[PDB]
Design an enzyme around this catalytic site. Structure first.
Site, PDB file in Angstrom:
ATOM      1  N   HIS B 351       0.480  -0.624  -0.022  1.00 58.37           N
ATOM      2  CA  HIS B 351       0.306   0.056   0.095  1.00 58.37           C
ATOM      3  C   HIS B 351       0.636   1.629   0.271  1.00 58.37           C
ATOM      4  O   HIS B 351       0.197   2.208   0.127  1.00 58.37           O
ATOM      5  CB  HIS B 351      -1.061   0.077   1.077  1.00 58.37           C
ATOM      6  CG  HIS B 351      -1.868  -0.686   1.072  1.00 58.37           C
ATOM      7  ND1 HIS B 351      -3.241  -1.088   0.019  1.00 58.37           N
ATOM      8  CD2 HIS B 351      -1.726  -1.935   1.675  1.00 58.37           C
ATOM      9  CE1 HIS B 351      -3.913  -1.760   0.692  1.00 58.37           C
ATOM     10  NE2 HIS B 351      -3.016  -3.130   1.282  1.00 58.37           N
ATOM     11  N   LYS B 542      -7.850  14.543   4.172  1.00 58.65           N
ATOM     12  CA  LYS B 542      -6.864  13.462   4.966  1.00 58.65           C
ATOM     13  C   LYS B 542      -6.875  13.614   5.577  1.00 58.65           C
ATOM     14  O   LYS B 542      -6.225  14.743   6.308  1.00 58.65           O
ATOM     15  CB  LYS B 542      -6.239  13.432   2.706  1.00 58.65           C
ATOM     16  CG  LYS B 542      -5.678  14.348   2.966  1.00 58.65           C
ATOM     17  CD  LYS B 542      -5.082  14.730   1.356  1.00 58.65           C
ATOM     18  CE  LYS B 542      -6.303  14.987   0.245  1.00 58.65           C
ATOM     19  NZ  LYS B 542      -5.845  13.632  -0.445  1.00 58.65           N
ATOM     20  N   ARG B 543      -5.721  12.490   6.185  1.00 61.38           N
ATOM     21  CA  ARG B 543      -4.598  12.871   7.475  1.00 61.38           C
ATOM     22  C   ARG B 543      -3.572  13.869   6.802  1.00 61.38           C
ATOM     23  O   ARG B 543      -3.433  13.970   5.859  1.00 61.38           O
ATOM     24  CB  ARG B 543      -3.808  11.687   8.087  1.00 61.38           C
ATOM     25  CG  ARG B 543      -4.991  10.375   7.868  1.00 61.38           C
ATOM     26  CD  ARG B 543      -5.235  10.702   9.098  1.00 61.38           C
ATOM     27  NE  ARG B 543      -3.809  10.948  11.144  1.00 61.38           N
ATOM     28  CZ  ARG B 543      -3.928  10.052  10.974  1.00 61.38           C
ATOM     29  NH1 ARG B 543      -4.779   9.194  11.674  1.00 61.38           N
ATOM     30  NH2 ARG B 543      -3.119   9.367  12.313  1.00 61.38           N
ATOM     31  N   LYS B 548       1.301  14.434   1.558  1.00 60.06           N
ATOM     32  CA  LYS B 548       0.465  14.858   0.788  1.00 60.06           C
ATOM     33  C   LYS B 548      -0.183  17.122   0.334  1.00 60.06           C
ATOM     34  O   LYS B 548      -0.841  17.231  -0.023  1.00 60.06           O
ATOM     35  CB  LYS B 548      -0.857  14.784   2.205  1.00 60.06           C
ATOM     36  CG  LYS B 548      -1.094  13.420   1.649  1.00 60.06           C
ATOM     37  CD  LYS B 548      -2.169  12.424   2.711  1.00 60.06           C
ATOM     38  CE  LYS B 548      -2.238  11.263   3.081  1.00 60.06           C
ATOM     39  NZ  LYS B 548      -3.225  10.632   2.674  1.00 60.06           N
ATOM     40  N   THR B 650      -8.408   7.155  -1.950  1.00 62.60           N
ATOM     41  CA  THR B 650      -9.842   6.497  -1.961  1.00 62.60           C
ATOM     42  C   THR B 650     -10.235   7.782  -2.147  1.00 62.60           C
ATOM     43  O   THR B 650     -11.384   7.860  -2.636  1.00 62.60           O
ATOM     44  CB  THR B 650     -10.237   5.562  -0.830  1.00 62.60           C
ATOM     45  OG1 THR B 650      -9.546   6.560   0.710  1.00 62.60           O
ATOM     46  CG2 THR B 650      -8.904   4.452  -1.531  1.00 62.60           C
ATOM     47  N   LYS B 654     -14.106   9.364  -3.911  1.00 60.75           N
ATOM     48  CA  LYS B 654     -15.199   9.757  -3.025  1.00 60.75           C
ATOM     49  C   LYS B 654     -15.620  10.927  -3.779  1.00 60.75           C
ATOM     50  O   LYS B 654     -16.748  11.080  -4.207  1.00 60.75           O
ATOM     51  CB  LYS B 654     -15.272   9.828  -1.414  1.00 60.75           C
ATOM     52  CG  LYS B 654     -14.695   8.505  -1.189  1.00 60.75           C
ATOM     53  CD  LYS B 654     -14.248   9.038   0.429  1.00 60.75           C
ATOM     54  CE  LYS B 654     -12.882   7.661   0.892  1.00 60.75           C
ATOM     55  NZ  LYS B 654     -12.941   8.025   2.463  1.00 60.75           N
TER      56      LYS B 654
HETATM   57  C1  LIG Z   1       0.500   2.105  10.247  1.00 59.02           C
HETATM   58  O1  LIG Z   1       1.451   1.830   8.635  1.00 59.02           O
HETATM   59  C2  LIG Z   1       0.924   1.976   7.650  1.00 59.02           C
HETATM   60  C3  LIG Z   1      -0.719   2.524   7.914  1.00 59.02           C
HETATM   61  C4  LIG Z   1      -1.380   3.326   7.066  1.00 59.02           C
HETATM   62  C5  LIG Z   1      -0.802   2.889   5.187  1.00 59.02           C
HETATM   63  C6  LIG Z   1      -1.459   3.561   4.533  1.00 59.02           C
HETATM   64  N1  LIG Z   1      -2.968   4.232   4.355  1.00 59.02           N
HETATM   65  O2  LIG Z   1      -3.002   4.431   3.384  1.00 59.02           O
HETATM   66  C7  LIG Z   1      -2.265   3.746   2.394  1.00 59.02           C
HETATM   67  C8  LIG Z   1      -1.370   3.860   2.942  1.00 59.02           C
HETATM   68  O3  LIG Z   1      -3.161   3.280   1.806  1.00 59.02           O
HETATM   69  C9  LIG Z   1      -4.730   3.094   0.627  1.00 59.02           C
HETATM   70  C10 LIG Z   1      -5.023   2.125   0.282  1.00 59.02           C
HETATM   71  O4  LIG Z   1      -4.736   1.500  -0.241  1.00 59.02           O
HETATM   72  C11 LIG Z   1      -3.969   4.104  -0.798  1.00 59.02           C
HETATM   73  O5  LIG Z   1      -5.149   4.465  -1.358  1.00 59.02           O
HETATM   74  C12 LIG Z   1      -2.884   4.752  -0.030  1.00 59.02           C
HETATM   75  O6  LIG Z   1      -2.446   6.408  -0.730  1.00 59.02           O
HETATM   76  C13 LIG Z   1      -2.170   4.656   1.151  1.00 59.02           C
HETATM   77  O7  LIG Z   1      -0.999   5.655   1.044  1.00 59.02           O
HETATM   78  C14 LIG Z   1       0.583   2.638   5.628  1.00 59.02           C
HETATM   79  C15 LIG Z   1       1.701   1.843   5.959  1.00 59.02           C
END
Ligand SMILES: COc1ccc(C2=NO[C@@]3(C2)O[C@H](CO)[C@@H](O)[C@H](O)[C@H]3O)cc1
Ligand SMILES: COc1ccc(C2=NO[C@@]3(C2)O[C@H](CO)[C@@H](O)[C@H](O)[C@H]3O)cc1
Lengths: 810, 810
Positions: B351, B542-543, B548, B650, B654
């Site tokens: 991801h 978003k976060r 970002k 995502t 939306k």
């Molecule tokens: C705690 O470690 C993580 C927490 C969150 C994430 C991510 N949050 O968003 C991410 C990756 O995954 C989404 C679902 O695939 C993507 O749409 C985002 O681009 C990506 O940043 C990655 C590592």
């Protein structure tokens, strides 16, 4: 099946079956294909609970409309046991549910065994609170029990290698269908901080806040459609608590630990900070709730007319300075008026005279945790001692004896003194105990305020302790005198006219034999232990403590064993000696006594010469649910505390109601039990209180008894030499040393009379007809010991309210 | 009211009303006299829940009978949001419940606002899991989501003095009506201990045990009567845990802390022991459950035919060595066979490519906590590197690059490498991202096993993200093309034939205006903030993260402000600029960015010259429930990450579905969105991935942009001099320093193109008809981004199962 269990009407049975099926589906999310006995228990519990709700809502709305004086029973302990059968009994649903479940292909008694005990108490004190709640609801009083919802109750006891092991009582693991969380009525409780003096009085600032979340449990009265509330507080951290981030969230546990675990001490004071926090937590949350309910009925003159607060020992004693704090600091009442209100509202029940059980809190603990309360306590003390000084001028020693503040190595607050000063009534729990209070420990206070001191002899509820646990006995009684005795136990006196009735004698003995057979079967099934149901069931069940003298019982057991070994071919009345009870985890001697009992059993139970003539069994994990099984099965009740040490006892009353004869000292309520039944119908032995006093003045020398009683010498030599511990010869050295050199409870002094009395027990048991006739004389005179009688006396003599047996509309 | 919300039949409405009243009475123990809005919410929730149970039981029994291949989705995060409306939507109960509650004198929308979000995720990754569960149920797959039941989810964000403050998300405080505790299916999980080598293989001994108790939540499919399960594990201490006594009971908290709190990091790896415990906890409990269900259908050859395990990033990567452990150590399979089964069972989704987000666990942590797993990982590594060495002989650097074990100061295990080695499929989450994986970070692995690498472009559920949050838009669409598009989003292409339809243009614009009015009203009511509903709603939610580029947005805002101050009497298109999102508590720069946004708002919102032409608002506590409110109200969607950093996104999808136009870089799924809608219908700006690569080779010099762009220089001078922080002149020094000297994300490099592109946005907004026509072209081409499409691709290309839109019997 049996009459006292109510009707099984076609409509009721049909409706119960469909609601059972509804709950299994919608509530439990199961079908009959994957459902386990536990699932069936929960479906039944939810079905029965549904019948409470209408009555519960209408009872509470009735109190709102009528606005009667409310009774608040504050306790750190409520030993409730199981709730399913009790609810069915009080709602007259037992036979209907038995039928409904039978038609569903289920055994209701099997389902009942699945429920966990609500073990939020140690023994007698917590169980008294539970019986009291039952009686208050049965007598139609607007009563509320307030306590703490411990996550862990009294530990489960396992016996491993003859030793007690403890495990956590995770009673909430599968959920509690009886409670209703009320997070909307959450209240703040304050700790620590400092006192700030302003233009307009004192202010308690910079405090740490813990939230108190209430859970409500219904308390049904006996077939009167009254359902009262027990409200138990649970500790919650505020959401900004300690707010790196992760640790701050994890540290919420520190606040929430307040309601985590019941202190497992019986008749012992452990002066720990966590315990003090528990005591204030329950008091602070409860008092806010009381005041809110009072305001939602400004004028605090009428407060004592609408509110009574009963303190179950000194554990909730902080209610006195907390009430003063609220009235003075928050409501802005003058001291004198606030004090008048407090005294007229509060009453105090003392439950023990044992010095090590009395609460004496170090000043330094109160200084840090509750700085405003300490200040208020000091002010109470000053004004009280000014009264004493005016009444007894120049009596300087009386002033130091009566002070709430005790001087010494560490200064302490005597909580009992605080309670007497701030209550309009002080009572003991049996006639002998209440007299001891006036003659000894509270003599100075009685001299100052004699009108304050009362007696309220303890009792037990005949619903749980006869109808529920012994339906066979309840039924044979009902056949002769009807059902009214269940809420009017004095009617049992009518059974005196049946003492020469041959049919009744037969039925009483039959019911006892059936109970003994059932219990012997329970022991084989759950513990693989084998006992002779034709033997005399000799039972001592209660917490393990030196004052209760399980050791005296042990000495008799070994005496019997030694006599058999001396003359093997001589006939003796066969006995099954059963001893059970938990020891406080930090109480070394109590743990040693348990090991001794199991060690004796190891020798006695495997000696081929003894055979089935003597068996010694330790009843593991003694608790309310086990009491309900063993008490109806008992022939002989052991109530053998040193005269002056057992304030009342309540186990004694349970045995009397269920057809056991009593061997006992003239201690606590034993005295009144013997008075009611007649001394000829009781097996009384040993020193009276006066005899103990004489021995103390002289000096107790255990060696004297050792030297003059050859049978006693033999036992001590057996213990010392390693007869009962061959692999560890000196295992019981601590026990022998205590017995010989520092026995506070004079075990040896009562030995000869005890053994002699036990011989008279065996002699009577050889004559089944005369044994049973004496049993009938006990059951018939047990009426005084209903908690309905006790509560009616509290109501009329302390609370200023009238009990009522009138039904509420269904 | 509206068609897409289903029928309100006389029978249904009558039955819902009576069941609502039944729950208020029996379940909540309240009457209409004392009941609060929260009580009414719970009565409704229980009423709706009842409709799930029959379907839930029959779905699960159907899977038992048919024995299809089961799909197990393992994730540390499930960001579910609220459940009430979603359940009504999927069961076609919305209009019926609206009617039923209206007749009871209640507003259902008011009741819906009472429910807490289930915030068991950080943002995109956790929300993807939630959309995936919805789609898997809608497509009739035998799917199970497995995770952790955190007591505390993502923290609640409060803004105090312009700064982020955190408080605990106590989401379970009032209870969770949706979950069913299953204490009967509790499983043991082992930690620590040591490895013992015997005659018959390795044994893991002397472990500490934590219990895993499952809670099940129903996951309803869209109007197909399928109800799947999300099973979340909660940590429990065994009853003999640490068994002075009191402390031992209190120390149970140590074990139970495993499931206490969600780590609040988005795209960041925090290598803490507690996090590792969480990761093993979910894996160990889940795998036992999988194996049990498989055996209750010996022959593990068919395991991969009946089981698919999807790893949501590397967080549950321990599933690979855990499965090997069970098959080798417990089931006694040979290594080669166990490995074959493991590879064919497991698949891995990556991801993110951000280096700081990749899991690299210190060997010393695994050595202590999971000694057997470390041994298995070493063995996997050796056998894998033997394969690499055979394929690329003599390439020693490749061996060190591809190793699961990384050498250095502290040796670490690369969990991504572990996942690739032990999975039969590896996918990225958007075409550009999946290509980046093959070209950069996983290039070596792609060269060894090209067949393993796939793309699965992310999606969102059109149930929550259109029908639920935007019924007005759903309805005007349904009026033209019917209802089938809700489970077949590709049908939205039919709206292309309405781009010149005057009635449709009017209706689309009307729905947007209504949404904007409703949201403007929500802001005044709950936050007392005033906004112009006639302005362009410019939204970035978003976060908070440097990648970002909320900072790039900030620069544009200040640019607009400065231009207004330069020429006050010149017309500009009015904007409401809204930025919201949480910062990880330990992420200093992210917290500084929040302060900057509020500081800009403090200046801009109170300047009389600006008036209602520009407003800057920080949206507090951005979460799923707030997304459902703000997204339908948005005109402009800000998707402005540096090319190559946002794996998919995502939120972008939306906004596209709900009638906002997008300003964005060619990053993540933005590329595919523009491809679907046509580049003419997207506001594309800035560097492509190739341009970023060119700049990195050259060296990024921010000073160059500062020197050549006068408008940018002005802003930096304003920030540095204290224009936005007069009382603390150097407050934003860290931000300026980062921008000027160590900006990994090249904010300045995209500034000019961004501002230029924003001018084109304003120009189009001046022409309402042409704005709306472009909106219609976006909505019409959003079909590809349904999670139904995504899941169908996983099903066919990875899991080897066929989706089904066939109804189960009701
Ligand atoms: C705690 O470690 C993580 C927490 C969150 C994430 C991510 N949050 O968003 C991410 C990756 O995954 C989404 C679902 O695939 C993507 O749409 C985002 O681009 C990506 O940043 C990655 C590592
Ligand atoms: C934790 O402190 C205490 C715990 C229990 C007790 C008691 N348990 O039993 C006692 C007193 O109260 C019963 C109810 O009045 C009496 O029947 C017992 O005789 C008495 O020992 C006293 C202090």
């Amino acid at each position: 099946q049996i009459s006292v269990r109510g009707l099984a009407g076609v409509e009721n049975v049909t409706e119960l079956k469909k609601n059972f099926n509804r709950h299994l589906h919608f509530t439990l999310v199961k079908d009959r294909n994957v459902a386990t006995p536990r699932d069936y228990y929960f479906a039944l519990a939810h079905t029965v609970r549904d019948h409470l709700v209408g009555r519960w809502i209408r009872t509470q709305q009735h109190y709102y409309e009528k606005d009667p004086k409310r009774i608040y029973y504050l306790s750190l302990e409520f030993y409730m046991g199981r709730t399913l059968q009790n609810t069915m009994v009080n709602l007259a649903l037992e036979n209907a549910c038995d039928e409904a479940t039978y038609q569903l292909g289920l055994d209701m008694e099997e389902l009942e065994e699945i429920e966990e005990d609500a073990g939020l108490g140690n023994g007698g004190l917590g169980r008294l609170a539970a019986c009291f709640l039952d009686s208050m609801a049965t007598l139609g009083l607007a009563a509320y029990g307030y306590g703490i919802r411990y996550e862990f109750g009294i530990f489960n006891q396992k016996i491993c290698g003859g030793w007690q092991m403890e495990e956590a009582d995770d009673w909430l693991r599968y959920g509690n269908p009886w409670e209703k969380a009320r997070p909307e009525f959450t209240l703040p409780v304050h700790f620590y901080g400092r006192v700030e003096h302003t233009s307009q009085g004192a202010k308690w600032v910079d405090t740490q806040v813990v939230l108190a979340m209430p859970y409500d449990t219904p308390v049904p009265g006996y077939r009167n459609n009254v359902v009262n509330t027990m409200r138990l507080w649970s500790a919650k951290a505020p959401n900004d608590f300690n707010l790196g981030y992760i640790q701050a969230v994890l540290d919420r546990n520190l606040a929430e630990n307040i309601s985590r675990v019941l202190y497992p001490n019986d008749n012992f004071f452990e002066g720990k900070e966590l315990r003090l926090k528990q005591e204030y937590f329950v008091v602070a949350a409860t008092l806010q709730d009381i005041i809110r309910r009072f305001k939602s009925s400004t004028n605090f003159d009428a407060f004592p007319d609408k509110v009574a607060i009963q303190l179950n020992d000194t554990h909730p004693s902080l209610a006195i300075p907390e009430l003063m704090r609220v009235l003075v600091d928050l409501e802005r009442l003058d001291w004198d008026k606030a004090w008048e209100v407090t005294v007229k509202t509060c009453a105090y029940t003392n439950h023990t005279v044992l010095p090590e059980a009395l609460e004496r809190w170090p000043v330094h603990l109160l200084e840090t945790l509750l700085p405003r309360h300490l200040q208020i306590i000091y002010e109470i003390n000053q004004r009280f001692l000014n009264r004493v000084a005016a009444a007894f001028p120049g009596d300087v020693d009386r002033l130091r004896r009566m002070s709430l503040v005790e001087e010494g190595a560490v200064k302490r607050i005597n909580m009992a003194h605080l309670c007497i000063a701030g209550s309009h009534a002080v009572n003991g729990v049996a006639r002998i105990h209440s007299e001891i209070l006036k003659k000894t420990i509270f003599k100075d206070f009685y001299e100052l305020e004699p009108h304050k001191f009362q007696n309220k002899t303890n009792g037990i509820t005949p619903r749980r302790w006869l109808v529920l646990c012994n339906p066979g006995l309840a039924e044979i009684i009902a056949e002769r005198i009807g059902e009214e005795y269940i809420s009017d136990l004095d009617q049992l006196r009518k059974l005196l006219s049946y003492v020469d009735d041959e049919a009744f004698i037969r039925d009483v003995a039959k019911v006892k034999q059936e109970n003994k057979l059932k219990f012997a079967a329970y022991l084989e099934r759950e513990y693989k232990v084998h006992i002779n149901p034709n033997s005399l069931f000799d039972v001592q069940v209660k917490r393990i403590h030196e004052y209760k003298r399980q050791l005296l019982n042990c000495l008799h057991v070994i005496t019997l064993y030694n006599r058999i070994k001396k003359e093997p071919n001589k006939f003796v009345v066969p006995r099954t000696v059963m001893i059970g009870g938990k020891a406080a985890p930090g109480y070394h001697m109590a743990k040693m006594i348990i090991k001794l009992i199991t060690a004796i059993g190891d020798v006695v139970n495997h000696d081929p010469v003894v055979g089935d003539r003597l068996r010694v069994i330790f009843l593991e994990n003694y608790r309310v649910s086990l009491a309900e099984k063993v008490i109806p099965a008992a022939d002989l009740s052991e109530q053998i505390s040193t005269a002056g040490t057992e304030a009342s006892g309540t186990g004694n009353m349970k045995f009397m109601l269920n057809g056991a004869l009593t061997i006992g000292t003239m201690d606590g309520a034993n005295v009144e039990m013997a008075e009611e039944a007649g001394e000829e119908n009781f097996f009384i032995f040993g020193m009276r209180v006066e005899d103990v006093d004489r021995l103390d003045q002289r000096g107790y020398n255990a060696q004297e008894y050792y030297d003059r009683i050859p049978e006693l010498r033999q036992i001590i030599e057996q213990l010392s030499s390693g007869f009962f511990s061959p692999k560890q010869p000196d295992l019981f050295k601590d026990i022998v040393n205590m017995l010989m050199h520092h026995d506070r409870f004079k075990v040896f002094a009562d030995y000869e009379e005890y053994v002699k009395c036990q011989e008279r027990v065996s002699a009577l048991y050889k004559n089944p007809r005369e044994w049973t006739r004496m049993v009938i004389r006990n059951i018939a005179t047990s009426g005084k010991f209903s908690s309905d009688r006790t509560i009616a006396q509290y109501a009329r003599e302390i609370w200023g309210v009238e009990p009522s047996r009138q039904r509420l509309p269904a």
